[PDB]
């Protein structure tokens, strides 16, 4: 049931007035959130895609990135709801709340502190505490507390401006415009290791989480007890050199009840598998099950296999122009149901949805 | 008047850029060429077109005259060309260097003088462009390529602020900043990189300008009353047009809705102003050929002078 | 193998000259070579010396600023002092290579010094040492030379007192048969990649030879001072065809002919100036294709219609016009968002030039010069193509109050960044950035050779060797000798440094001297931006006046002559406005007596912007 | 799917500075265009109607009517864009292009040559050609090229001033101050048949296309094979008689590859059904699905059926004055998706919008 593949044609077509930048899926009901380039933020119904549910103009420039998380709170006093943040080129990030009863956007608050444009934002929950992390052109990979609304730890991991980040537990890796990758410990801020090997600016980099039950996986199954106790084994990258590389994140000098320490002899990333075949810059990637879903600026979205390492299927000429971002459902989390859908967003002001 | 808007507007725009570095003779020749070209492709234009009468309004004309500019028409045209270039920085070429006082009068105390032969030049220039004060540069024939970004306007939009790189460190700018370049040597060598990117304007005095200034002098001395009458009637016509527009706005605001004595008095004032405008037009129709008679009368003196 | 610069093709002429060269060099007689700049004297010299077991090779390249210290340093690496000067090898004799003997300059009193040093060496059979004043004996070291005739603008004739002691040979251009055989071998080697077209080796070589002969016979030096065609251009054409086929898709015959035509267009006619000269070139291409390659179903061979790109795919192949234009549009939008922003309008001529500069930049040791009027979009195009290929722009911030110190420190920092830090850099050179001839000869040293030895001396040389050893140990390479580190360094520099030259006014004396420099003309691809033709101006004007309301009056279509309409045939008032502006610009530049000087089109753009703003208001 | 009646409460109440003359809808985005009496053209988006996106002075006199079509070029050389054309009493036919990225109008060209008040303008697209049809009160129907701007063919089809224009296929019906409405072909410009049966000027006439698979539609099904091969059967006409007449076009003498000729015995239309039970002047009639929609001057709008032909829902108190215009989405073309939202105009400086 985890080996689902979208069919050769889109299930439905979604029209937006401007260039589509970021697309996200509601993890409980088939609702597609679409960001624009004119500054609008949209929302659509999958079964009724004729007109949007609601729209809201919160930023004076384009929205660069967006993610969706459905919170889970142990206490019964708090009510479970949805959080949307849209990082935008107008120096600010905003927080929205989805209203199920009214089907209308309601802005919660807004954060500030970046000295240039923000390019990627990620959200996660550790234990009944929601944290928002963002990276910008001022190289300040910042973090935030959702309840407090104040900055916690600001650090600069790179000389050139960072572009994309990903977060899991207390560990954050970040691609950058200096064609290098680097892990940074989220609470402390020490750079555990660095990665080199690309020849072009980094577009999107995200983790490769663990999975419980699978027949065989050669890129997610942990190897030894050290990896089992750590939790992070491999990471994947996508840069503008038309290549997707799967890396091995090195072990640090870890100590119990102590901050991780870098290894002088093992603080360098290790390239494991390379991929090629995309005709332009790999804009965004997504991992679900054992299949690597990625796009490019070649008007196409390609499907890759983790184990054998070649493109099983190709969706050529999916858009008239460039393809911007993809999305799947999170499979490593039991709270989120990994439904059989995948949605793309193009630069030609059209959004396509693949279902069943 | 709307049938000829495209023809009259293109002549003004083409006059601002190409004809900055020419004297009266080839300016008239190229205007004849342009009129022939416009008539060839059947694009209508005003036969009685004047650049001063189309761009230089009365208020800015009096403002330029009181600042210290000479009353010559050529200098008025070049002044209008210089201070109507929002995108391209103008270049001033005047041997007399009188216009520095004119720009100082125009901008008041905000005029700050800088020279390329200085030594603390770059620091005061970046401080001034951070403040946004107007900067006038002397000795432009020794161009310093450190301000090539300012000449080319190759800023980048870093955030919500305009950002430029000058020298070796980042500096910020603001919208109030304007730059001027003044030069003194007519034969001074100029780099092509600056020459093709600036509005090259020649403030000189040529033989055709000699003839024009002599005609101006003999007109303002032999018959000063007729020149004063022409200036007075032009100013009176402009004032009458402004008063007519104001009275029309008041009359429409008072009588468009739904009469009383105020509306009747406004209508009487409008009638009187219309009659005065008609009388002024009738009087001016019998005064323009006198200037043609004068220019047919006082051209042999110009030929002798040249 | 054709990428390697040591590969030669033995024909009758080169083996005959090698035999007589061995006869002259055995005769204890000085040897001087003198031929046209395309004769390949250095090629035959290297082939003769490097493949003989009786003689060795020493690396000396004369320049305008050369003293006997360079000769002493070069001879010290191969010879020894016993007081008799003796080479290290006791069997093979030493041949002193001296290319461009005409290149060193005369002194303040009408004489040259290093040529008299050579005259003393090959006449008095030794020399006097300067610091200890001791006589030196030389027994088996001969001296050879190879220089152009001094009639060209830049070679100073040496006195007869030197040439009396050396034999002189003339190496003219090889005839049609020798070129046909050499490029027959080259085309068989290149067609070994794709065996499906091996039978077409002879027509390709015949077409290339005939095209080169016609291009040399048609365009001469009298029309333009930089029309110095040579067989080196044919070699570069073959190298371009190889680097196109190697990174290309499945290849057909029509695509082969299109690839050859595109390579000929970008290697032979990119330096042309006149429009009728380009028309004659395209007529030559049509005639050559008709004569030697009778193939049907062949499309247009115009410059715009020959678009080969590596951007749109993983391999070098022809791409459609509209897809390429859209890709360039979106990439330029992203570039101006990330970097400095300029209101640039997209036209087919800029697409052709951006593809040709992208082709030029990807080549190993690829350098080129841009010749065009000001505000024709050269620096911005170079920055755009450098950002597209991941290059790093090092723009020389050279002001009037600058000297050689800033130039050498900028070059040293650039070289260190290229080699030590392993980052490819695209260096631009402006006309205003070269004040005196010292910068020109520094660029000559950097381009003609692989590095500048003047930058690294003494403690600088020692720390350079230390840094090279540190980097070599970092990469784990077994290199210990200083020669291995040094030539690996110059190989890395030649692999990771592409320089371009921006020239505004070629008629000027400094630009004429720069393009007449023999060390920069041969090694750099000559790209002629030129002036805008009427079609480019029409496209720019149409794309700039569409944003404004223009049709608001009754317009009667005016019937005018065919040659007076440069835009597509007139139907609207916008076409009338565009044609009027173009006609005015042509008449204005005709009546300002500009001559053959390039016309800057910035007046047109400024007039269009002022027009649209004023008509909006 | 094609039977979604709007609700009693209108979704949006758009405020306009002056009275509304004509309203057209964007065929891909939820943006409504409002034409005023002063000549202002407003760019209103539905989800926040307080502020206009753009407002330019198209004409100076009263705008009569407008049409909006989305261009579809089969060649990739030209990028598809919206086209808005307006007609007024200013002897001008302005054409605007709406750019969604900058959300502002942009005038392309204006068409001149008429000598009286221009009443109606309709757009229709060929495979690669776009044409504009217009008619003045000087009994002249013209044809305008979109790019050339010239007048192709003109003729005089009526003896009185004309106020209704429709162009679907290659025919046209023009209803004058006289009841006489006629069909003239474009390549020939010859009248075929004349309509009579109304005692007042006819205001608006539009054709009815051939609908797709429908259960029990009655006035859209092809009756005869020759009529189906011709491709157009029925018509709907307005009047000031407080009634609507559905007509029937007789077949002309159609010959292959030549301009056809009329029939003397069949030079008159047939009246099939009369739509009686109305209370004022009927301004605009537009057709979609089983339900025929009309607008009343007497402060109301009425939508009646097509099969049985009577009331189902009557909307009252929508506007306190005279309702001027409405726009059903065209469900007849495959290039446009027939989404569920309605918009109506009026003389009370307001426009009501229905959604879903
Ligand atoms: N006999 C030959 N075999 C192979 N290539 C040749 C031959 N003669 C000339 N060439 C080509 O001509 C070019 C001459 O280059 P070069 O030796 O630099 O000229 P020069 O010695 O005059 O500076 C070389 O690139 C070489 O490939
Ligand atoms: N269509 C065009 N093509 C080339 N340049 C243009 C065009 N339109 C405007 N420009 C101007 O050209 C300038 C860039 O030219 P650049 O390469 O810097 O000239 P140069 O090579 O003389 O330095 C820009 O500042 C811009 O204003
Ligand atoms: Mg040579």
Distance CA A226, CA A250 (A): 11
Q: Are C602 and B197 in contact (CB under 8 A)?
A: yes
Burial environment of residue C463 by CB neighbours within 10 A (0 to 12, 13 to 18, 19 or more): exposed
Distance CA A20, CA A64 (A): 10
A253 at D interface, C-beta within 8 A: no
Beta bridge partners of residue A151, listed in sequence order: A144
Atom number of ligand 1 nearest to Cα C41 = 21
D6 occurs within a structural domain:
no
Sign for the CA dihedral angle at C102, C105, C110, C111 comes to negative
D80 occurs within a structural domain:
yes
Residue in C with minimal Cα distance to A298: C312
Distance CA A96, CA A43 (A): 12
Ligand 1 pocket test, pick from C7, C13, C14, C43 with the greatest ligand atom count within 8 Å of Cβ, gives: C43
CB pairs under 8 A between B and C: 116
**Structural Rg of chain B based on CA atoms:** 24
| 3-state SS record for C329-359 | HHHHHHHHHHCCCCCCCCCHHHHHHHHHHHH
Counting the structural domains of chain D, the total is 1
Evaluate whether chains C and B are touching (3 or more beta carbon pairs less than 8 Å apart).
yes
Please give the DSSP secondary-structure letter assigned to residue C322. Answer: H
Any atom of ligand 1 within 6 Å of the Cβ of C232: yes
Distance CA C419, CA C497 (A): 9
Any atom of ligand 2 within 6 Å of the Cβ of C504: yes
Distance CA C299, CA C301 (A): 6
Question: How many whole angstroms from C142 Cα to the centroid of ligand 3?
Answer: 20
Evaluate whether chains D and B are touching (3 or more beta carbon pairs less than 8 Å apart).
no
**Structural Rg of chain A based on CA atoms:** 19
Residue nearest to atom 15 of ligand 2 (CA): C377
In this complex, the residue of D107, D112, D149 whose CB is nearest that of residue C549 is D107
Q: Which stretches of chain D are DSSP H helices?
A: 225-230
Cβ within 8 Å of residue B272, ≥6 positions away: none
Is C576 assigned a ligand-binding role in the annotation? no
Contact A117 B159 (CB under 8 A): yes
Distance CA B123, CA B138 (A): 17
| CA C467 to chain CA centroid, nearest Å | 31
Q: How does A224-238 read in b/e, with b if 16+ C-beta sit within 10 Å?
A: eeebeebebbbbbbb
Q: How many CB atoms lie within 10 A of CB A315?
A: 22
In this complex, the residue of C313, C330, C390 whose CB is nearest that of residue A279 is C313
Distance CA B39, CA B177 (A): 41
Residues written for chain B = 306
Give B93→chain C minimum CA distance, Å: 19
Any atom of ligand 1 within 6 Å of the Cβ of C518: no
Question: How many whole angstroms from C579 Cα to the centroid of ligand 1?
Answer: 49
DSSP B210-247: HHHHHHHHHHHHHSHHHHHHHHHHHHHHHHHHHHHHHH
- What is the end-to-end Cα distance of chain D in Å, rounded? 11
Mutation for testing the C interface, residue in D77, D91, D109 having most C CBs under 10 Å: D109
Residue in B with minimal Cα distance to C508: B192
Q: How many CB atoms lie within 10 A of CB C302?
A: 12
Parallel, antiparallel or unpaired: strands C141-147 and C93-99 = parallel
| CA C393 to chain CA centroid, nearest Å | 19
Is C16 assigned a ligand-binding role in the annotation? no
Beta bridge partners of residue A31, listed in sequence order: A45
Calculate the CA dihedral of residues C67, C72, C77, C83 and round it to 10 degrees.
Answer: 170
Helix C68-78 and helix C114-123, axial crossing angle in degrees, nearest 10: 50
A4 occurs within a structural domain:
no
Subunits next to D (3 or more Cβ pairs <8 Å) are A, C
Ligand 2 pocket test, pick from C357, C377, C605 with the greatest ligand atom count within 8 Å of Cβ, gives: C377
A88 occurs within a structural domain:
yes
Please give the DSSP secondary-structure letter assigned to residue C196. Answer: G
CB pairs under 8 A between A and C: 15
In this complex, the residue of D48, D100, D339 whose CB is nearest that of residue A17 is D100
Residue nearest to atom 14 of ligand 1 (CA): C40
Q: Are A245 and A274 in contact (CB under 8 A)?
A: yes
Q: Name which of A284, A254, A256 is nearest A345 in CA terms.
A: A284
Sign for the CA dihedral angle at D151, D157, D163, D169 comes to negative
In this complex, the residue of A15, A18, A54 whose CB is nearest that of residue D101 is A18
Atom number of ligand 2 nearest to Cα B153 = 25
Please give the DSSP secondary-structure letter assigned to residue A155. Answer: B
Structure token digits, residue C540:
């720019």
**What does each C-alpha distance from C332 to A163, C66, C325, C336, C542 come to in angstroms?**
19, 46, 10, 6, 20
Please give the DSSP secondary-structure letter assigned to residue C105. Answer: P
Parallel, antiparallel or unpaired: strands C425-429 and C392-394 = parallel
In this complex, the residue of D77, D106, D109 whose CB is nearest that of residue C551 is D109
Distance CA C370, CA C385 (A): 14
Question: How many whole angstroms from C379 Cα to the centroid of ligand 2?
Answer: 8
Distance CA C352, CA C348 (A): 6
Q: Name which of D42, D3, D2 is nearest D20 in CA terms.
A: D42
A117 occurs within a structural domain:
yes
Tokens 């900028």: give the residue.
C410
Subunits next to B (3 or more Cβ pairs <8 Å) are A, C
Question: How many whole angstroms from C520 Cα to the centroid of ligand 2?
Answer: 25
Any atom of ligand 1 within 6 Å of the Cβ of C42: yes
Q: Are C404 and C454 in contact (CB under 8 A)?
A: no
> In the Cβ-directed half-sphere of A216, how many Cα atoms lie within 13 Å?
3
Please give the DSSP secondary-structure letter assigned to residue A258. Answer: S
A172 occurs within a structural domain:
yes
D172 occurs within a structural domain:
yes
Distance CA C582, CA C537 (A): 7
Q: Are D80 and D116 in contact (CB under 8 A)?
A: no
Evaluate whether chains A and D are touching (3 or more beta carbon pairs less than 8 Å apart).
yes
Q: Cβ contacts (< 8 Å) between C505 and chain B: which residues?
A: 192
Distance CA D249, CA A272 (A): 75
DSSP A22-33: -EEE-SSSSEEE
Structure token digits, residue B87:
């995108």
A97 occurs within a structural domain:
yes
Give B260→chain C minimum CA distance, Å: 39
3-state class of A289 per DSSP? Answer: coil
B160 at A interface, C-beta within 8 A: yes
Distance CA D9, CA D18 (A): 23
D32 at A interface, C-beta within 8 A: no
Element containing residue C367 per DSSP (H, E): strand C367-372
Distance CA C50, CA C95 (A): 11
| CA B7 to chain CA centroid, nearest Å | 20
Question: Which residue range is the domain that position A40 belongs to?
Answer: 11-356
Q: Are A41 and A63 in contact (CB under 8 A)?
A: yes
């Amino acid at each position: 049931v985890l080996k689902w593949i979208p069919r050769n044609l889109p299930s439905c077509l979604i029209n937006v007035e401007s260039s589509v930048t970021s697309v996200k899926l509601h993890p409980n009901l088939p609702i597609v959130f679409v960001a624009t380039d004119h500054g609008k933020l949209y929302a659509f119904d999958l079964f009724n895609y004729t007109i949007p549910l609601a729209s809201l103009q919160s930023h004076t420039k384009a929205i660069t990135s967006m993610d969706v998380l459905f919170t889970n709170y142990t206490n019964s006093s708090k009510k479970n709801y949805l959080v949307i943040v849209t990082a935008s080129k107008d120096l600010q990030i905003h927080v929205f709340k989805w209203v199920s009863e009214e089907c209308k956007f309601q802005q919660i608050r807004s954060l500030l502190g970046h000295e240039h444009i923000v390019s990627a934002v990620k959200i996660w929950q550790k234990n009944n505490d929601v944290h928002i992390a963002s990276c910008s052109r001022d190289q300040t990979v910042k973090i935030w507390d959702f309840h407090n609304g104040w900055s916690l730890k600001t650090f600069q991991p790179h000389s050139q401006w960072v572009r994309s980040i990903d977060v899991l537990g207390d560990y954050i890796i970040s691609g950058s415009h200096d064609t290098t990758l680097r892990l940074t410990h989220w609470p402390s801020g020490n750079g555990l290791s660095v990665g080199t090997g690309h020849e072009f600016p980094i577009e999107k980099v995200k983790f490769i989480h663990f999975i419980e039950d699978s027949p065989e996986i050669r890129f997610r199954t942990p190897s030894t007890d050290r990896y089992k106790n750590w939790g992070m084994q491999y990471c994947v990258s996508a840069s503008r050199d038309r290549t997707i590389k799967i890396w091995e994140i090195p072990l640090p000098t870890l100590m119990a009840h102590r901050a991780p320490i870098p290894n002088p002899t093992d603080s360098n990333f290790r390239c494991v598998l390379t991929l090629k075949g995309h005709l332009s810059w790999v804009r965004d990637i997504s991992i679900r099950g054992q299949y690597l879903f990625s796009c490019a600026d070649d008007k196409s979205v390609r499907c890759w296999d983790l184990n054998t390492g070649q493109c099983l299927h190709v969706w050529e000429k999916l858009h008239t122009g460039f393809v911007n971002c993809l999305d799947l459902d999170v499979d490593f989390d039991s709270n989120v149901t990994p439904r059989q859908m995948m949605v793309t967003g193009g630069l030609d002001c059209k959004s396509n949805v693949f279902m069943r | 008047t709307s049938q000829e808007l495209i023809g009259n507007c293109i002549i003004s725009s083409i006059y601002e850029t190409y004809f900055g570095h020419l004297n009266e003779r080839e300016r008239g020749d190229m205007l004849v060429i342009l009129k022939r070209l416009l008539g060839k492709f059947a694009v209508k234009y005003d036969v009685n077109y004047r650049f001063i009468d189309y761009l230089v309004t009365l208020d800015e004309k009096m403002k330029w005259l009181e600042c210290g500019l000479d009353k010559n028409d050529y200098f008025l045209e070049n002044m209008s060309i210089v201070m109507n270039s929002q995108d391209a920085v103008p270049f001033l070429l005047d041997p007399s260097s009188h216009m520095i006082t004119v720009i100082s009068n125009y901008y008041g105390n905000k005029t700050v003088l800088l020279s390329f032969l200085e030594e603390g030049f770059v620091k005061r220039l970046e401080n001034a462009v951070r403040f946004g004060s107007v900067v006038i540069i002397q000795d432009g024939e020794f161009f310093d390529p450190i301000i090539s970004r300012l000449i080319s306007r190759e800023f980048n939009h870093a955030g919500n602020r305009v950002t430029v790189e000058i020298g070796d460190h980042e500096v910020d700018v603001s919208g109030d900043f304007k730059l001027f370049i003044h030069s003194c040597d007519p034969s001074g060598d100029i780099p092509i990189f600056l020459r093709s990117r600036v509005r090259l304007v020649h403030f000189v005095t040529n033989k055709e300008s000699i003839e024009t200034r002599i005609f101006d002098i003999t007109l303002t001395e032999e018959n000063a009353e007729m020149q004063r009458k022409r200036e007075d009637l032009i100013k009176l016509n402009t004032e009458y047009r402004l008063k007519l527009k104001n009275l029309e706005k008041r009359l429409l605001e008072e009588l468009n809705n739904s009469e009383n004595d105020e509306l009747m008095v406004t209508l009487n004032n409008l009638k009187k102003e219309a009659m005065n405008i008609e009388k002024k037009l009738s009087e001016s129709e019998e005064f323009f050929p006198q200037f043609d008679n004068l220019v047919e009368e006082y051209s042999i003196i110009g030929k002798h002078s040249v | 193998e054709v990428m390697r610069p040591d590969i030669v093709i033995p024909t009758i002429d080169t083996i005959k000259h090698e035999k007589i060269f061995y006869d002259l060099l055995n005769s204890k007689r000085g040897i001087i070579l003198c031929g046209p700049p395309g004769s390949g004297k250095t090629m035959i010299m290297n082939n003769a010396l490097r493949n003989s077991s009786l003689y060795d090779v020493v690396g000396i390249n004369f320049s305008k600023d050369t003293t006997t210290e360079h000769i002493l340093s070069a001879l010290h690496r191969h010879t020894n002092y016993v007081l008799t000067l003796l080479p290290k090898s006791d069997i093979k004799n030493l041949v002193l290579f001296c290319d461009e003997i005409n290149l060193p300059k005369l002194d303040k009193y009408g004489s040259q010094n290093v040529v008299l040093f050579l005259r003393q060496l090959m006449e008095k059979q030794g020399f006097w040492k300067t610091p200890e004043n001791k006589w030196v004996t030389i027994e088996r070291i001969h001296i050879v030379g190879a220089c152009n005739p001094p009639t060209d603008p830049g070679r100073i004739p040496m006195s007869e007192r030197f040439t009396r002691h050396a034999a002189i040979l003339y190496l003219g251009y090889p005839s049609g048969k020798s070129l046909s055989q050499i490029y027959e071998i080259y085309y068989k080697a290149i067609f070994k990649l794709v065996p499906e077209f091996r039978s077409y080796t002879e027509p390709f070589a015949r077409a290339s030879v005939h095209l080169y002969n016609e291009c040399k016979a048609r365009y001469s030096t009298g029309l333009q001072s930089h029309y110095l065609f040579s067989p080196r251009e044919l070699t570069r054409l073959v190298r371009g065809v190889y680097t196109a086929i190697n990174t290309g898709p499945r290849q057909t015959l029509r695509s082969l002919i299109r690839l050859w035509a595109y390579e000929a267009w970008r290697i032979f006619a990119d330096r042309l100036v006149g429009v009728k000269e380009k028309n004659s070139f395209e007529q030559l291409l049509y005639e050559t294709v008709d004569k030697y390659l009778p193939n049907q179903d062949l499309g247009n061979i115009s410059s715009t219609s020959l678009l080969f790109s590596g951007l749109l795919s993983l391999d070098f192949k022809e791409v459609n016009k509209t897809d390429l234009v859209n890709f360039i549009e979106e990439r330029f939008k992203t570039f101006c968002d990330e970097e400095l922003e300029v209101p640039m309008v997209i036209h087919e001529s800029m697409v052709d030039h951006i593809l040709r500069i992208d082709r030029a930049l990807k080549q190993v040791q690829g350098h080129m010069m841009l010749i065009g009027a000001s505000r024709t979009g050269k620096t911005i195009l170079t920055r755009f193509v450098a950002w597209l290929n991941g290059l790093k722009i090092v723009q020389p911030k050279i002001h009037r109050h600058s000297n050689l110190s800033d130039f050498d420190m900028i070059l040293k920092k650039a070289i260190s960044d290229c080699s030590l830090k392993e980052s490819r850099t695209c260096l631009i050179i402006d006309e205003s950035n070269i004040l005196e001839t010292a910068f020109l000869e520094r660029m000559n040293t950097l381009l003609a050779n692989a590095d500048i030895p003047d930058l690294f001396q003494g403690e600088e040389y020692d720390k350079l060797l230390n840094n090279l050893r540190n980097k070599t140990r970092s990469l784990g390479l077994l290199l210990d000798t200083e020669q291995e580190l040094y030539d690996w360094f110059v190989g890395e520099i030649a692999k990771n440094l592409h320089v371009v030259f921006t020239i505004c006014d070629p008629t000027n004396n400094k630009s004429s001297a720069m393009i007449s420099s023999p060390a920069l003309f041969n090694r750099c691809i000559i790209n002629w931006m030129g002036d805008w033709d009427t079609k480019t101006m029409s496209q720019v004007a149409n794309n700039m006046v569409d944003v404004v309301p223009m049709e608001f009056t009754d317009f009667i279509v005016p019937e005018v002559n065919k040659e007076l309409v440069f835009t597509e045939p007139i139907q609207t008032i916008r076409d009338a406005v565009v044609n009027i502006l173009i006609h005015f610009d042509r008449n204005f530049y005709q009546k300002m007596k500009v001559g053959v000087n390039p016309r800057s089109p910035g007046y047109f753009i400024d007039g269009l912007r002022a027009l649209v703003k004023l008509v909006t208001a």
